[PDB]
Amino acid sequence: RVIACFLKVCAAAANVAAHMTHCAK
Ligand SMILES: [Zn+2]
User: Fold this and answer.
1) CA angle at residue 11 from 10 to 15, to 5 degrees?
2) What is the distance in A from the centroid of ligand 1 to the CA of 17?
3) Residues whose Cβ atom is located within 5 A of ion ligand 1
């Protein structure tokens, strides 16, 4: 969902599964 991501480039990477690494719980 990359919705919880409160970043720009991070959330704007179209890679939730990839972003989840640096944006997990
Ligand atoms: Zn993120």
Assistant:
1) 90
2) 10
3) 5, 10, 19, 23
